[PDB]
Scaffold this active site. Structure first.
Site, PDB file in Angstrom:
ATOM      1  CG  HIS A 293      85.869  83.821  52.790  1.00 46.72           C
ATOM      2  ND1 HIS A 293      87.217  84.107  52.848  1.00 46.72           N
ATOM      3  CD2 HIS A 293      85.369  84.548  51.755  1.00 46.72           C
ATOM      4  CE1 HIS A 293      87.508  84.994  51.910  1.00 46.72           C
ATOM      5  NE2 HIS A 293      86.404  85.289  51.246  1.00 46.72           N
ATOM      6  CD  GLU A 294      81.730  83.919  50.746  1.00 45.17           C
ATOM      7  OE1 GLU A 294      81.844  85.179  50.675  1.00 45.17           O
ATOM      8  OE2 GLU A 294      82.504  83.104  50.175  1.00 45.17           O
ATOM      9  CD  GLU A 316      87.718  88.569  48.756  1.00 45.98           C
ATOM     10  OE1 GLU A 316      87.765  87.670  49.642  1.00 45.98           O
ATOM     11  OE2 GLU A 316      86.643  89.021  48.348  1.00 45.98           O
TER      12      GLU A 316
END
Ligand code: DAB
Ligand code: NA
Ligand code: NA
Ligand code: ZN
EC number: 3.4.11.2
Length: 866
Positions: A293-294, A316
């Site tokens: 994700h990051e 997001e």
């Protein structure tokens, strides 16, 4: 506190193109010098308004001239009479050690580090703290060498020096313009795991993962996951990392999970540190998901950012979808899809029926940190996944490429992303845009008819979305509705109409619509909304036998699980109504048989069996009901578990033994066998007592990994087995000095079904491993009680509410972001019966009268009391 509105967006009057930051670092008083090159785009007489919170201004210069034409107001430095281009220099002081809210520059144990999303940079200096202002940063850090031998900021290290008095300095330069929410600074003493990754075009990237001294042994998996993330983004999206270093820092005091600061991610150490005796399969898989994700934010978030915060989902939804595709490509796709759907139906749907309901692109916001939500993230990702369903992979990738081509280097909006997908694919998405601006969950009602004379099957599908607290007006959506029709042998019937194949992803765009299929040579069993192809509630009148047939024959594993969930839903609702009348569990024999069939099927994937044998949680069970009876739901889940334990005892024990594995591997086939085995163990814990007690202590003591030990310890607590206190006390004695490990134990204590659970939880506020200063501990003990022990939290005497009120009275001053996660269970009061409503309202009135009520709680409490 004042609301802000998406329709009020205006381009800024000033831009900043470059900023040079110097931190003269010290925990009590840090001095910040900020030199910004600025440009006025609006009228000569509009002043520059800089955001700033809790800053002590020391001086203001414009082109080196001490400036007299300024004033301070509530949250701002307003500077007048500026030329068209100028250097702004600001000097100010802040105090990391006083920062208990963990926003801006703060202290994490002995380290200093930052958190700036959404609006934390204004806690560090006066700035245009809004994500459509993008600038090139260089950051010089000066600090005590013995205390802070590592000085980190975004980008590359371009300069370094020593000073007298045992100080030193380092300067960093990040070549890519960034909005200031992506700024980061870390100072402290760390062990560093160093590795390298070579991108597919040959750029070698140094990888560095900073952890507390003594923790290097818990780091390789995160590092492996990072390389796996970088490789996957290359292969699936064609995206390479764009810098020479990638740093990750694990800190223990963090509010938001992990953060994508450009080239310098900061992570709650809960999503970095794993060793097989401290972390479970699920920890491994979460470390992998969050590292991904990051990392995926590097493109969807950093190279293309958000024009304003109302566009949070642009980064997001899209990055959650990316971390899901990643986990799904590397592990089991069906198991991922299943867990994502449980989260959607059991947690997101509840939010979308609450006073805090909002569209994935909000229209109004008081405290932007309140909007890091299941809706923005998980429903956002379902929205992206529906674009994928409508376009197909190839068109979707083309949209990705067009989006980066048009928008690399700037701040964009959700509408820009949709528009790129629409232009690259030629699929029309103007009606589809309504998913960005409408909140609440659509309800899709399907009726069907089979015509033996014409061999035609007719679906009449209708939709509506009930009103929500935030929007009185609702309209039909563009709902992609995937179906499969099965004949009596379990084979797929080709979809067609008038001699032509028909796409099995139906476009449900109207309030009501009929679809007719031809050449349906046998009365079909439908699989409806396959792979949960839109985030809607399905209303269809299934028979038990249609469902067990899907369980046996559906082509996708997700549909098999999902047919089992609809089978259980009926009996969960039956037995909750029975519990309210004082009656015991009633379950037809053929339902127990359907799960027996799953235990004994030798061809079924164990990962799939394990998920079908995991009952809906209390939160998913709660979404079955208008009014939630949290005690009835908890007792029913237990009794259903006891009934199946009794009916399937021999099968359960046999499958439990056959899935024994002496080697521990973090490998998807092994995880799957272990999940099935522990799902069996959980039922066994609820069968005959003596055997339960033996199986469980035995697994706990013989486990060679934390997955098998925790599953034991957890079954002992859930079923209140005789060995429970002894096992619990052992885990404390062994693990007390380890906060991440103790979090699991606090969770068990908080969610225990024991009658005195509130009493124990209050005593645990004094426990050697608990502290109110650490968000992970607060969440593990207090948040798990309020949010995950609904039976105890909603005790009839209202003791649960009073307890949360005391804690939130502390946290409102200490750490409003954590306070605001924790209040959530109280703002669901309208889902509960009158008498619980009245106490919850009284608790919220009490919080509402607090002296310095934070904006974060204020927004939620007033929407809840409305
Ligand atoms: N960007 C904010 C931090 C959050 N945990 C995320 O990774 O999206
Ligand atoms: Na896969
Ligand atoms: Na019908
Ligand atoms: Zn994110």
């Amino acid at each position: 506190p004042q609301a802000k509105y998406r329709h009020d967006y205006r381009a800024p009057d000033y831009q900043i193109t470059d900023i040079d930051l110097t931190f003269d670092l010290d925990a009590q008083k840090t001095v910040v010098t900020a030199v910004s090159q600025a440009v006025r785009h609006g009228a000569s007489d509009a002043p520059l308004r800089l955001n700033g919170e809790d800053l002590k201004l020391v001086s203001v210069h414009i082109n080196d001239e001490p400036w007299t034409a300024w004033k301070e107001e509530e949250g701002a430095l307003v500077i007048s009479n500026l030329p068209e281009r100028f250097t702004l220099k600001i000097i100010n002081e802040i105090s990391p050690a006083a920062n208990t809210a963990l926003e801006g520059l703060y202290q994490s144990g002995d380290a200093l580090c930052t958190q700036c999303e959404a609006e934390g940079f204004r806690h560090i200096t006066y700035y245009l703290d809004r994500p459509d202002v993008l600038a090139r940063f260089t950051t010089k850090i000066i600090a005590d060498k013995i205390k802070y031998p590592f000085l980190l900021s975004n980008g590359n290290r371009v300069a370094q020096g020593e000073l007298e008095n045992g100080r030193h300095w380092v300067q960093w330069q990040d070549p890519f313009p960034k909005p200031c929410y992506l700024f980061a600074l870390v100072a402290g003493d760390f062990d560093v795991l160093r590795d390298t990754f070579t991108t597919r075009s040959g750029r070698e990237v140094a990888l560095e993962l900073y952890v507390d001294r003594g923790n290097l042994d818990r780091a390789p998996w995160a590092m492996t996951s990072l390389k796996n993330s970088m490789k996957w983004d290359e292969e699936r999206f064609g995206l390479e990392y764009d810098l020479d270093i990638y740093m990750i820092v694990a800190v223990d005091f963090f509010n938001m999970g992990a953060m994508e600061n450009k080239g310098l991610n900061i992570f709650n150490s809960k999503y970095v540190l794993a060793r097989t005796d401290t972390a479970t399969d699920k920890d491994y898989l979460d470390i992998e998901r969050v590292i991904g994700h990051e990392y995926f934010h590097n493109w969807t978030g950093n190279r293309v950012t958000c024009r304003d915060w109302f566009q949070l989902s642009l980064k997001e939804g899209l990055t959650v979808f990316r971390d899901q595709e990643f986990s799904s490509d590397l592990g089991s796709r069906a198991v991922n899809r299943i867990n994502n759907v449980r989260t959607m139906r059991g947690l997101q749907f509840a939010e979308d029926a609450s006073p805090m309901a909002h569209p994935i692109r909000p229209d109004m916001v008081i405290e932007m940190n309140n909007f890091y939500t299941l809706t923005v993230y998980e429903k956002g990702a379902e929205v992206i996944r529906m674009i994928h369903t409508l376009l197909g992979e190839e068109n979707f990738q083309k949209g990705m490429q067009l989006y980066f081509e048009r928008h690399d280097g700037s701040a964009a909006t959700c509408d820009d992303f949709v528009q790129a997908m629409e232009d690259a694919s030629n699929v029309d998405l103007s009606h589809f845009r309504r998913w960005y601006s409408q909140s609440g969950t659509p309800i899709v009602t399907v009726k069907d008819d089979y015509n033996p004379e014409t061999e035609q099957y007719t679906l009449t599908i209708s939709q509506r979305t009930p009103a929500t607290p935030d929007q009185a007006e609702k309209q039909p959506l563009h709902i992609p509705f995937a179906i499969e029709l099965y004949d009596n042998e379990g084979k797929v019937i080709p979809l067609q109409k008038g001699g032509h194949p028909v796409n099995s992803v139906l476009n449900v765009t109207q309030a009501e619509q009929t679809f007719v299929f031809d050449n349906v040579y046998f009365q079909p069993v439908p699989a409806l909304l396959c792979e949960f192809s839109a985030p809607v509630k399905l209303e269809y009148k299934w028979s038990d036998q249609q469902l067990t047939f899907l369980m046996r024959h559906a082509r996708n594993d997700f549909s098999r699980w999902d047919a089992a969930q609809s089978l259980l839903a009926t009996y969960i609702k039956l037995n909750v109504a029975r519990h309210q009348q004082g009656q015991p569990l009633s379950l037809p024999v053929h339902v127990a048989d359907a799960f027996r069939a799953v235990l004994l099927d030798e061809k079924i994937d164990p990962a799939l069996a394990a998920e079908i044998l995991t009952l809906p949680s209390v939160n998913e069970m709660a979404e079955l009901f208008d009014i939630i009876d949290p005690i009835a739901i908890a007792e029913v889940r237990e009794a259903l578990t006891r009934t199946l334990a009794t009916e399937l005892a021999d099968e359960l024990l046999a499958i439990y033994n056959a899935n024994y594995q002496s080697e521990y591997r973090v490998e998807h086939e092994d995880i799957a066998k272990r999940t099935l085995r522990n799902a069996c163990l959980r039922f066994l814990a609820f069968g005959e007592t003596h055997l339960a007690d033996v199986l469980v202590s035995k697994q706990f003591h013989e486990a060679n990994n934390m997955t098998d030990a925790l599953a034991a310890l957890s079954a002992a607590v859930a079923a209140q087995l005789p060995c429970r206190d002894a096992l619990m006390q052992e885990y404390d004695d062994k693990w007390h000095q380890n906060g991440l490990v103790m979090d699991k134990w606090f969770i068990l204590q908080a969610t225990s079904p024991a009658a005195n659970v509130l009493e124990t939880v209050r005593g645990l506020l004094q426990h050697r491993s608990f502290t109110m200063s650490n968000p992970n501990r607060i969440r593990s003990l207090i948040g798990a009680f309020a949010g995950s022990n609904p039976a105890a939290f909603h005790a009839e005497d209202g003791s649960g509410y009073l307890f949360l009120v005391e804690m939130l009275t502390d946290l409102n001053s200490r750490n409003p972001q954590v306070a605001s996660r924790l209040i959530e269970p109280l703002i669901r009061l309208k889902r509960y019966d009158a008498k619980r409503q009245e106490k919850m309202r009284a608790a919220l009135e009490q919080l509402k009268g607090l002296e310095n009520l934070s904006g974060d709680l204020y927004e939620k409490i007033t929407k809840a009391l409305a």
